[PDB]
């Protein structure tokens, strides 16, 4: 899975897609939660490839977003679409990021696909098929 290595690269990545969701994982490869998440993101990448591209960002090597994206969870996954952060209601109370090892591969595809169809349709907000409380 591709990595972004500085702020400029992250900006380039977001600006590189017209018709796909850019999924970013902020964290650390050596981190346990990020390993679980990275496993899932890896195995579903082929499937989401017409509507989604995934990148990893280490938030020590690339600290630029730590304060504003509030990256205080070990593993954060966030969604972008034509340069707009897209939100998902996960029934968690936090609509800006998925911040846990979301173990179910098919569920991740569903969420990523929902975000894509929503963001294309113009919503800045969609809800995950499953409630996660």
């Amino acid at each position: 899975l591709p990595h972004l290595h500085n702020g400029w690269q992250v900006d380039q990545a977001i600006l590189s897609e017209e018709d796909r969701v850019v999924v970013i994982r902020f964290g650390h490869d050596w981190d346990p939660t990020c390993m679980k998440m990275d496993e899932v993101l890896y195995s579903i990448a082929e499937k989401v490839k017409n509507f989604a591209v995934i990148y990893l960002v280490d938030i020590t090597e690339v600290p630029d977003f730590n304060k504003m994206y509030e990256l205080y969870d070990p593993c954060t996954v966030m969604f972008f679409f034509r340069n707009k952060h897209i939100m998902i209601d996960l029934g968690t109370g936090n609509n800006n990021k998925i911040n846990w090892a979301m173990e179910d591969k098919q569920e991740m595809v569903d969420i990523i696909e929902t975000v894509y169809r929503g963001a294309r349709k113009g919503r800045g907000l969609v809800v995950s098929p499953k409630d996660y409380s």
Partner: peptide, 22 residues
Amino acid sequence: PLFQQRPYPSPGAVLRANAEAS
């Protein structure tokens, strides 16, 4: 509802804001 979570800015805008802060 009242006081709904707002979306974070884009990476470009974040980076620009950091530049502003300096």
